[model samples]
Target chain A: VTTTRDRILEEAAKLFTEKGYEATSVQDLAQALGLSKAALYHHFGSKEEILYEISLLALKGLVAAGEKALEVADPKEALRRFMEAHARYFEENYPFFVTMLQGIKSLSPENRLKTIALRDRHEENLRAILRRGVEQGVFREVDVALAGRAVLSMLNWMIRWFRPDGPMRAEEVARAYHDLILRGLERGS
Target chain B: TTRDRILEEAAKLFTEKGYEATSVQDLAQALGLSKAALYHHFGSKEEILYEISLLALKGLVAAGEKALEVADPKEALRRFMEAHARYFEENYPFFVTMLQGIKSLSPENRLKTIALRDRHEENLRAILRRGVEQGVFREVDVALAGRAVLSMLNWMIRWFRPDGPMRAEEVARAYHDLILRGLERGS
Candidate 1:
């Protein structure tokens, strides 16, 4: 059984993703959770906090998975794991992905700063892995930060068109990125 | 004067308010035109969104076409990405609305805009395909490579702030080098 807090976060993520975060009401979110308005407040202080938690949850997962990715020894294999892990993170936390991309702007200014700090930390961490790949002589000496950002943009964009019942499985899509990012598409390369 | 002004003012409104939230009155007020005048110019708010999509994407398309005309495949791809970066730099808000608001357009309008995007992607794909054929670019999966590269180029707009420390051309050159190295033959 999930805790009520976890349940609220999930439900809020869904509503925020579907309905505009600005459009969703705390009362509506409470009803979706089968709780009274005040009961919801008792669990969380404000709606923005809910959005913050969703951002926190989403970024924390990617950052954590990226942390695990660095442990793998092979730079090529390590890069694949990083992409694959991020792809799964996006699939599993679809609403959180939405939250991070579209809804995070709704965060209060102070909260926005806090969330962005975490974002940069993880982003730079991924960049470091690329630097390490170059150091290992397993990858090209690409611009590490830009390369990492490109990999992220490609993975994050799948959420726009990817469907669970669509042409590709999640694992299949992740694996495809693995091959594309690690090795160039041209056999000649 | 009127049509150009309508297009300019409406584009800004849609970028700020988003297609779903922006109303005909919102556009009319922004342009200092009456609602009926707005309707006279645009059949619906959807029409405005579609028009913006066409304008914004066509600019990108022209840039890509020009970029691809370079003789060397490597330089062709480089200029294409650099053009993309600069396009986003000058047209930041327009690109944002183009990406986020295009889907909200009516089906006929959506199809119209989608074709432009498809043309844009196809043009880039052909460039990369030739790069592969020439034994200059790596050949993993040409189609997937095209999409991934476009995604990267498109998303850079969201992170790029015109007022920030980075110069647009400098940023463009950095991205070009990064993607070029990614697709280059492994030594």
Candidate 2:
């Protein structure tokens, strides 16, 4: 059985994803959780707290995924793992990730900084992988930061049309993205 | 002075106050004209939005056409991306309305806007196909690679700024470099 707080986070993610964070209320979350508003407050101080927690949970997963991806020594392989890990995390935690994307701006100031820090850490980690690739002469002498954004934009934009149960799985799409970025569309470059 | 001014001012208002919140009277007041006078130019607020959307997409389509005239496929791809980013940055609010205001459009207007968007995407795909045909580019998934390039350009709306360190075209150049050369180094 899930704890009451964990259950609240899950239900809130769904509601926030579908109805949006601003439109969702403490009462609405409570209703969705089948708990009294008082009981809900006893768990989360306010609706913002729930949003903060959801953001926190989502970033932590990504950061952890980054840590695991970097464990590989080869930068090229590591980059592939990084993208695959991100896609896997996104698909496995659909509602949480969606809520994290949609409700990031709704976070409180302190929560926002904390979340931003996590995102920066994630970006920095990805860049580190790119830097290593260049250092090892395995990657081109491109700007690591810009290349990082290229990889991220491709993946993040997936939220626009990617369906978990659609024709293409998340990993499959990630592989395609990796192939394009690693080798590019240019022939025999 | 012209319906163009009305469209420009209306686009600014729509971008700031949002399409749903901004009204015909609000747009007219912004232009220092009467609501009826504004209606003289646009039948409804949706019409104004549809016009702005059409303007934005048409400008982009025109840029792509011009870019495709470059003799080299590689240079053409670079020019294509630079043109897209230039248009998006220079026409920030209009593109903003064109992209974000679509959901608020009527079915007929929305269909027209969607087709225009597809036309833009089709242009990028054509460039990729040209590269592959000329033996300059690999036979990558034309559709997917095209979207990847478009994503890098369009997603710039989230963080890119005109007043920021990098110009939009410059940024697009860097993106073009990344895609054309990719991340892997030559042996």
Candidate 3:
């Protein structure tokens, strides 16, 4: 029941993941989708456009979810909520995020800048939350940038081996991550 | 002898040229055989890729399963970390390419691969849960710790090189220590 646009995006995602950006030809993408090259152009103006659309969609969803989690008043709670939302998001939208992470470097220069901007904005949101936690005496004073990156590095990795039917649910996974991050930030007991 | 040779050569070619870019002809060429000879052993290129993927997963699962049999949580975690690192090191190219090529797998193969990966993660979660119960690990969410450990483990694939100064065991020990004790100075 996928629309033509959706089909094109899916095929493009697969192609980008497989052959990389510079290597994946427009014709290859069209053929993969079982469409003519001309028809593929009708759905999307260019490869860069398709990439921009996919990257934007992925970042917007993640950033919005993280922002919502940041609304929690307790820093510890905020961290927990944010990680849970992240795990849940990956659990649901893994393909999109995987393509975004792996294929991001294949984006055209201008599009890459846009994607980086969106990513930076998301990181900034995480930094603000971490900084607030430190200020409120909830978390030990740590470099917000490193903390943000650590959280992101951990979350971005879920696509490699996360499973919905696994022993622990996504929320349970998030809580475990919360303890690890909190323990990493706090002084020894 | 011929079949095993084909598998080894296909794995090498697939790891080097990638699953999509590497053709059956290329595999045959590497093996000094005709495409017909290669086809005599395997049905198609997809079949070759599938075999390699499954082999890698089986190795990983076997290692994790062995570690989980440990009675001590700390020992379990250490063994899991060490074995995970060693697996990646011993089969570096196959492991890395399997990860990279997963997105392009045929639908059925993709599902099978995912199932294998999930089994490994479940094993890790079981170990974490044991650690938490035994007070060996902090009372953190077992699932979260499992994911974090997974993240750290997989990230090594992105940065680890055989020629790197630290051996796989060294890196695994560092990660094990970091995960078990955290990065804080004292704790």
Candidate 4:
């Protein structure tokens, strides 16, 4: 059986995704979870607490995956692994990601800086791999900034539509994306 | 016939009003049926949403699979583009509303729906892999290519309409050219 905390997280994720952080109220979340408002407050002190918990969970998962992928020596392979891991995570746990995306604007300045710091660390990990590849002459030289943004914009948008029962699978999608990123960065035709 | 009508009207309303803003009573009024009658057809708001979502996804999957079966990567990508355009044209509202409805699904249903979406991306990825191995595509990052294709594909939901001046086929053809060749100025 799910714990009360788990139940609260699940309902908050759904509400935040749909109504967005600004529009969703504590009462609405309680109603969605079939809990009383007082009960929700008992678990989470404020709405910000709920949002913070969800974002932190997602960021932690992402950072951990990214850190592991960065340990690989092959820059190209490492980048591929990083993108694949990120995409798969988002594909599988989109509600959490969506909640983060929708609620990022509402976070306090301090909390926002913390979130950005975590994200920058993740990006730097990927950039370091790319820089390593460039130095080794194994990968083509390209603007790391542009490449990073391209990688992110493409993967982040997957939350819009990625059905499991559809014709393709997650691994296959990741592989294709791996090829695209390689092509965009490769030096010679 | 009744089931078909309800699905049709629901698709229209859900697309226009959005899933959260749309209620069963509103759907019933649009269909000229009583709320009980609509309820008899669909047990809940989510059921109707699911039906429409499934229909839209099935159409896209069928088209994508058909495209992948083609002999050549370029040809397959072209076919995929055409099919994608046609699907969107016929089911613009369904696609748009479903895209908007992602955040609104019940917890269990939301996870199930996301799995379905992942499958679609996987299929597209496989097709790109084939092209890469065939040497038709440049030696680029397959994952990035796949994401590029997807980003471009999903963007259609934000800006596509049936009554718009440009035909679906025309738009798909243009998009296909862009994806395969890109926007770089010719040397």
Measured against the true structure, the TM-scores of the candidates, in listed sequence, are: 0.86, 0.91, 0.67, 0.56
**Interface RMSDs of all predictions?**
3.5, 1.4, 5.1, 7.9
lDDT by residue (A134-172, candidate 3, tens digit) is: 788666556666566567768766665566557756656
Candidate 1: residue B100 Cα off by (Å) = 4.6
Provide C-alpha RMSD values for all models, in order.
3.1, 2.3, 6.2, 8.9
Off by over 4 Å in 4: A1-19, A26-188, B103-108, B185-187
RMSD of 3: 6.2
Highest-TM-score candidate: 2
Per residue, candidate 2 scores C-alpha lDDT tens digits across B53-135 of: 88888999998888777878899999999999998888888987775567679999888877888888998888889999989
lDDT of 1 by residue, B1-187 (tens): 5675577777777777876678788888888989998788687877776777787889989988997788888888878887877877777767776776765788888887888889989989989989888887876577777877787777776687778998665776776565555522363
lDDT of 3 by residue, B74-171 (tens): 88888998998898888776786686567667999999988998999999999888877776666665666777777777777765778888787777
Q: Label model 3 with its docking quality class.
A: incorrect
Q: How does candidate 3 score on lDDT?
A: 0.75
Q: Write the per-residue lDDT of candidate 4 for residues A77-174, one digit (tens) a residue.
A: 78888888887776666678888876776787888788878878887887887778767876655555445544565666666556644866565666
TM-score of chain B of 1: 0.88
Local accuracy of candidate 4 as per-residue lDDT tens digits, B115-187: 7767767777777788878877665656556667667566566445678887776666765554565312221
- The numbered model that scores best in lDDT is 2
Deviation (Å) of B92 in candidate 2:
0.8
Q: How many angstroms is the interface RMSD of candidate 1?
A: 3.5
Q: lDDT order of candidates, best first?
A: 2, 1, 3, 4
